[PDB]
Design a protein around this ligand. Structure first.
Ligand code: 3PE
Ligand code: NDP
Ligand code: ZMP
Ligand code: SF4
Ligand code: SF4
Ligand code: SF4
Ligand code: ZN
Lengths: 297, 48, 114, 156, 95, 176, 208, 146
């Protein structure tokens, strides 16, 4: 282990954690809190960004001087991926779109780009790789999202055999598109059962998966502590928010139940206690204001 | 400098560069010292 | 050993002032959680008040606990009048700080601090 | 292509209007406020660049952090920053706003305003002169001139 | 006289270059390592040794009060030249 | 040795009373203010055309730092650390060793330009005129760590601005 | 010793020594020392129970009339058991003169507030609460004046470190400016500058 | 001048033997576990210790308590002192009992089997100061060293 990557300090902002992290997709929602929790340890966070540099400004106070290296990359340029990962000791993937675009479909975002990142990270000597799938990923799933994400998970597993693949159920938080989706829909109630996971629990799970050497080659299912039906969940969202852009793929995924995978470990086997919805939903939905808790199963 | 030229030197930049900040020619800081503590290298031969 | 007091003549008047300051904090906590719109419960803030009062419970000097009551009244005055922001109230909850190693072995693993 | 030409010309238009009409909200913290008041004085005259003098913090386009940021005022700085409409920019003026400065090792000073807000232009000096602050404002304008919001929107 | 590591990184006049397996080369990715290519150790070697007929020479680096504090150098060793401690200009007694 | 500002008892004859009442009813001092503002409307303004026109500076001006060289290529810094003992901000970090020919030279010469108060105690404490605070003031960066200068950046500022720095020192050194 | 040496003012030295004797003999209940510096500044070191009777004297007495409180100061000297040294600087505009009234306390003994004599003291001794921790009894509004609102400790105490114990940064997880234990990317470098040779033989203390 | 060996050849990370029989770097958990698994399988004379020349009394009594939990008394030093007779029971037969300062009070010093110029150079400096100022008579039994 090299002398510059030995940890030092008391784990604060000016400390050294020995984590040289390349977070693909740090400009989004999971990457926000992930770069926050990495940089507050004193980790060398490499942020490959695709967007305008203005849209990366919030990542800049998240660490000490020189501890966030921004650089350009393309999903169809393996040279830029190698230019981003050739010094990192961990590579986290967080590339995702809820909607397919003119230049990237779900096959590009969930299959081609994660396999490219994992292949280049294998042939660059990166120790640790973390992939973020979805809990309901299935080949025979109704939505194209979960089909291509199951395909990309299989490809990441077969091209990086030690890839820590993580299954969040439905991540809620401030900049989420789950509770902010329900508070701004003003779809319906069915027999769909969900257990949504909190974003800080997911971030602590990812960083404890970095820190646990036994999490290599594993597959985790980051689920919340309380399973809810869809209907009383949506009624609880409209009860907290003081209320009386979509596609059919999101309609299929909201009416897709969060499956139970007891053979996979979860948040507790990384040392993270799951934060329930009712302690954070007021914090999420206070912005939407111009409460009896939901029924669990 | 046409009337009173500056005194020439062999180390003065013949090509003046403008502010390079924001370009790939910008300044990146680093520690200009070498490594202080030297680590022990274990022997590459077996011990039996 | 004959010293000039601050307010209290012995420990009984001192504990009386501690107790009235505790009453004032206990009454104030729901107002503080409302108007700072804190994301903690009222019970969580009241547990923090009980923690901040039990932290100084080892003191037997009347002048020292008189100064603790005075500084607690100052903190309460900065709380009731909105002089603190939400950030100053939530600095009692060390929420961005990672949990410190407690036993010998984890402190051995992380570094050199005893 | 054709749409690439359209988003190029529209980026040129909106970047022209955003760099040629910067409205600053200046935090008059410390001695750097005096030199910002000289950058508004007749010799340097920010107003001839379209850079108005003292816009209100809810219609301003750029926050000039001019002076020392202490621990007692850092939440007020972050509050004013969060209340700015986007696109918002931050010019850090002087050594105390940049990195703590002459009060860097103090108990009551935020070691640079970049621990609090994302900073675009770091203007160095104690204080940097009104000409140097005007240099930093024109460098901010050049930074806005090369923004590619619609080109990246078209390529996403 | 700048040289180059097997990583392609330029070595400074100190001798500083990062290791290949050091992560801190990622700060120069997409940017440049600013080195100064005028090495003073080579530039003072280019200066000729001043043959003087005295036994003790005085050096102030030229320019009078624009050089260094004025020092006096002994030239009684004939194997070694008399090197100024400030400017590195080395002197020799000609006899 | 003192004077009374605003201790004028006004006249009460009908002349001065009617003068003050005409000033009240006909707004004499308001037209005096409009006249002064109209007078500055027709003056040539004091605005210089930056960046094309520059504000006037003196050769004493204290801007960007630069490590200098002797007129042979040899650098002037003999690693004596007076500039970091005198530095009021502790912006200067110096580490030294004898180099390959035995000269007392630095390996680390850092200046944090965001700690620096630009007061020039380093150039006046320097016994050999190595560190100077040159005339560049237009060196704003887009990133905080670009204002954290090492020895390479400072020697490059010396090589970049020596043709100006030497002339400024030549113009000023008999005051020093 | 004409050009480079400060000229001594013997007239003001004699006048301030005489007025120091005057104050010491009018108020022997509290005056502990009276001294005059070589640059002619009078210090009246008193007992802390006589903060109000001395200061009301100098403010009101017809031979004193120290109507102005210029400055009020504490000095932390930890080697004394009464570590804090409360310093009053007074200006008589009538007699064109200045006096210094010095007293002492530790952390736990209160000093009586001098707002009943100089209302100017209302903030100054309040600053002495903020920076040093000296409590002032019967003060109108005693609270902090300069430190941040949740600030623990009194900063100008000499056992308090230069940088504090905490530092702030914005944290986007909790969307809040937060406090954390202080870590410095570069430590403050401590310079041991004192020469081991005696500088001033007039100020030599006798050995053990 | 030996403080620069204090920055060369240093052990900075725990090392364990890999599958090829070579020392490779590892964490503290792995190294302490691979030592403690063997320490739990020992008892009696199965485990022993050698104390080197530069070990403080804290680590000495630490490793003594650790091996006494295994019921092992076999804890040794490199430098051989004879255990015959009183041994290390009385402190007086393994100390410089007079003192380093007591050389100034002696009149005859007999040095036996030692070259104290290089074994204890400031003890020899104190013998030389007593030789110079107090007319100390020194005799040596051993090789005629300087
Ligand atoms: C299909 C393809 C087309 C798609 C739609 C676009 C239609 C045309 C839109 C207007 C023109 C777009 C191009 C904008 C300018 C691009 C070039 C540029 O930036 O030139 C810079 C130049 C000044 O240079 P500068 O960088 O400011 O230098 C500082 C001083 N040395 O700048 C100048 O000299 C001035 C630039 C002025 C820009 C045009 C004038 C303003 C816009 C008018 C039309 C829109 C508004 C209509 C009315 C609104 C209500 C009043
Ligand atoms: N509720 C949730 O958030 C959950 C998310 N997940 C999965 O976790 C991952 C991250 O989630 P999340 O942060 O919420 O999603 P976001 O859409 O908010 O973030 C995706 C990130 O990837 C980047 N990105 C997207 N498409 C591309 C592309 N074609 N090429 C390059 N970069 C691209 C985005 O950058 P830019 O801004 O430049 O477009 C952004 O930084 C996704 O894979 C998602 O499926 C799983 C379970 C729950
Ligand atoms: C939301 C956040 C709000 C934060 C509020 C912080 C306020 C902090 C106020 C602290 C004031 C004190 O600590 S005064 C306590 C000191 N008292 C003592 O040392 C005496 C011991 N006190 C006790 O034992 C107390 O339990 C009692 C109640 C006085 C007596 O109990 P004993 O009988 O068994
Ligand atoms: S950087 Fe210096 S001159 Fe500028 S405001 Fe700060 S203290 Fe004043
Ligand atoms: S720059 Fe000057 S003062 Fe500083 S160490 Fe070098 S020679 Fe000494
Ligand atoms: S100008 Fe002053 S603060 Fe700046 S490096 Fe020189 S001595 Fe230090
Ligand atoms: Zn010389």
């Amino acid at each position: 282990l090299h002398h510059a990557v030995i940890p030092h300090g008391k784990g604060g902002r000016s400390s050294v954690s020995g984590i040289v992290a390349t977070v693909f997709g740090a400009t989004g929602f999971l990457g926000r809190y992930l770069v926050n929790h990495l940089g507050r340890m004193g980790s060398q966070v490499i942020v490959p960004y695709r967007c305008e540099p203005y849209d990366t400004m919030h990542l800049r106070p998240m660490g000490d001087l020189g501890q966030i290296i921004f650089m350009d990359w393309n999903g169809r340029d393996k040279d830029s991926i190698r230019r981003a990962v050739e010094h990192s000791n961990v590579v986290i993937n967080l590339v995702g779109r809820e909607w397919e675009t003119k230049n990237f479909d779900f096959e590009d975002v969930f299959v081609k780009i994660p396999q490219a990142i994992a292949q280049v990270s294998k042939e660059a000597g990166v120790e640790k790789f973390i992939h973020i799938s979805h809990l309901n990923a299935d080949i025979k799933s109704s939505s194209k999202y979960l089909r291509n994400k199951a395909v990309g998970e299989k490809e990441v597993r077969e091209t990086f055999p030690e890839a820590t693949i993580i299954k969040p159920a439905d991540i809620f938080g401030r900049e989420d598109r789950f509770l902010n989706y329900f508070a701004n829909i003003r779809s319906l109630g069915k027999k769909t059962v969900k257990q949504p996971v909190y974003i800080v629990d997911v971030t602590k799970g990812i960083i404890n998966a970095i820190k646990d050497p036994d999490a290599r080659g594993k597959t985790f299912a980051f689920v919340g502590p309380n399973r809810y039906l869809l209907f009383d969940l949506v009624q609880y969202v409209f009860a907290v928010a003081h209320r009386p852009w979509t596609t059919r793929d999101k309609v299929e995924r909201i009416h897709t139940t969060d499956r139970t995978l007891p053979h996979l470990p979860g948040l507790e086997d990384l040392g993270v206690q799951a934060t329930p919805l009712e302690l954070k939903a007021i914090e999420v939905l206070r912005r939407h204001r111009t409460v009896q808790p939901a029924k669990t199963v | 400098p046409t009337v009173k030229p500056p005194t020439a030197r062999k180390f003065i930049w013949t090509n003046h560069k403008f502010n390079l900040s924001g370009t790939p020619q910008q300044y990146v800081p680093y520690s200009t010292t070498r490594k202080k503590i030297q680590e022990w290298v274990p022997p590459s031969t077996p011990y039996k | 050993t004959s010293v000039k007091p601050i307010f209290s003549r012995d420990m009984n008047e001192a504990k009386r002032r501690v107790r009235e300051l505790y009453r004032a904090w206990y009454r104030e906590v729901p107002n503080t959680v409302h108007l700072f719109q804190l994301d903690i419960s009222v019970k969580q803030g009241r547990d923090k008040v009980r923690e901040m009062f039990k932290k100084n419970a080892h003191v037997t000097d009347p002048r020292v606990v008189d100064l603790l009551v005075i500084k607690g009244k100052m903190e309460l005055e900065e709380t009731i009048n909105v002089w603190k922001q939400r950030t100053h109230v939530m600095r009692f909850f060390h929420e961005t700080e990672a949990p410190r190693p407690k036993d010998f072995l984890s402190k051995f693993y992380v570094g050199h601090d005893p | 292509s054709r749409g690439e030409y359209v988003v190029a010309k529209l980026d040129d238009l909106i970047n022209w209007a955003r760099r040629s009409s910067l409205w600053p909200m200046t935090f008059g913290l410390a001695c750097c406020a005096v030199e910002m008041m000289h950058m508004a004085a007749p010799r340097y005259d920010m107003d001839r660049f379209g850079v108005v003098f003292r816009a209100s913090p809810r219609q301003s386009d750029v926050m000039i952090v001019a002076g020392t940021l202490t621990n007692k005022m850092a939440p007020a700085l972050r509050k004013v920053y969060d209340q700015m409409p986007e696109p918002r920019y931050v010019v850090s003026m002087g050594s105390c706003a940049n990195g703590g400065g002459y009060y860097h090792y103090s108990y009551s000073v935020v070691r640079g305003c970049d621990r609090i807000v994302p900073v675009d232009i770091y203007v160095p000096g104690c204080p940097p002169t009104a000409e140097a602050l005007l240099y930093g404002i024109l460098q901010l304008q050049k930074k806005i001139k090369r923004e590619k919001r619609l080109r990246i929107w078209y390529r996403r | 006289g700048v040289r180059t590591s097997p990583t392609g990184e330029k070595v400074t006049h100190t001798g500083q270059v990062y290791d290949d397996e050091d992560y801190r080369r990622v700060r120069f990715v997409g940017r440049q390592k600013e080195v100064n290519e005028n090495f003073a150790i080579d530039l003072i070697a280019e200066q000729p040794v001043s043959q003087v007929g005295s036994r003790v020479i005085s050096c102030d680096g030229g320019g009078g009060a624009l050089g260094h504090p004025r020092v006096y150098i002994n030239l009684d060793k004939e194997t070694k030249t008399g090197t100024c401690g400030y400017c590195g200009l080395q002197f020799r007694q000609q006899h | 040795t003192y004077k009374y500002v605003n201790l004028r008892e006004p006249s009460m004859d009908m002349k001065s009373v009617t003068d003050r009442a005409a000033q009240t009813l006909l707004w004499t001092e308001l037209i005096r203010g409009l006249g002064m503002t109209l007078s500055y409307l027709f003056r040539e303004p004091a605005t210089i055309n930056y960046p094309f026109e520059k504000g006037p500076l003196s050769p004493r001006f204290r801007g960007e730092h630069a490590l200098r060289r002797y007129p042979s290529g040899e650098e002037r810094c003999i690693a004596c650390k007076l500039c970091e003992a005198v530095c009021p901000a502790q912006a200067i970090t110096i580490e030294a060793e004898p180099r390959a020919d035995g000269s007392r030279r630095t390996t680390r010469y850092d200046i944090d330009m965001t700690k620096c108060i630009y007061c020039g105690f380093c150039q006046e404490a320097c016994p050999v005129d190595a560190i100077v605070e040159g005339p560049n003031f237009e060196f704003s960066t887009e990133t905080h760590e670009e204002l954290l200068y090492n020895k390479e950046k400072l020697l490059n500022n010396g090589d970049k601005w020596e043709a100006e720095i030497a002339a400024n020192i030549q113009a000023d050194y008999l005051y020093r | 010793t004409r050009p480079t040496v400060r000229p001594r003012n013997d007239v003001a030295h004699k006048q301030l020594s005489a007025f120091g004797e005057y104050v010491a003999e009018i108020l022997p209940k509290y005056v502990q020392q009276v001294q005059v510096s070589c640059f002619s500044e009078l210090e009246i070191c008193i007992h802390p129970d006589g903060v109000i009777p001395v200061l009301t004297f100098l403010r009101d007495h017809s031979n004193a009339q120290f109507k102005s409180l210029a400055d009020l100061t504490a000095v932390d000297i930890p080697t004394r058991q009464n570590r804090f040294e409360i310093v009053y600087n007074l200006l008589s505009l009538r007699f064109n003169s200045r006096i210094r009234v010095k007293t002492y306390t530790d952390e736990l003994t209160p000093v009586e507030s001098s707002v009943s004599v100089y209302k100017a003291a209302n903030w100054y001794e309040r600053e002495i609460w903020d920076m040093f921790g000296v409590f002032f009894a019967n003060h109108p509004d005693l609270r902090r004046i300069l430190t941040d609102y949740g600030f623990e400790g009194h900063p100008f105490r000499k056992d308090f470190p230069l940088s504090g114990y905490v530092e702030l940064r914005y944290d986007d997880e909790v969307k809040r400016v937060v406090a954390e234990p202080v870590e410095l990317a570069q430590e403050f470098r401590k310079f041991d500058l004192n020469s081991p040779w005696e500088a001033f033989p007039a100020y030599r203390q006798p050995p053990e | 001048f030996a403080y620069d060996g204090l920055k060369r050849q240093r052990l900075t990370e725990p090392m364990v033997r890999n599958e090829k029989g070579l020392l490779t770097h590892t964490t503290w958990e792995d190294a302490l576990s691979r030592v403690a698994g063997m320490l739990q399988s020992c008892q009696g004379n199965d485990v022993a210790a050698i104390a080197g020349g530069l070990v403080d009394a804290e680590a000495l009594i630490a490793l003594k308590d650790l091996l006494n939990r295994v019921d092992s008394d076999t804890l040794c030093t490199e430098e051989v002192f004879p255990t015959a007779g009183a041994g290390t029971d009385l402190r007086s037969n393994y100390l410089l009992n007079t003192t380093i300062a007591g050389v100034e009070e002696a009149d005859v010093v007999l040095l036996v089997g030692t070259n104290p110029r290089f074994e204890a150079p400031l003890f020899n400096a104190r013998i030389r100061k007593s030789w110079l100022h107090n007319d100390l008579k020194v005799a040596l039994i051993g090789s005629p060293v300087d």
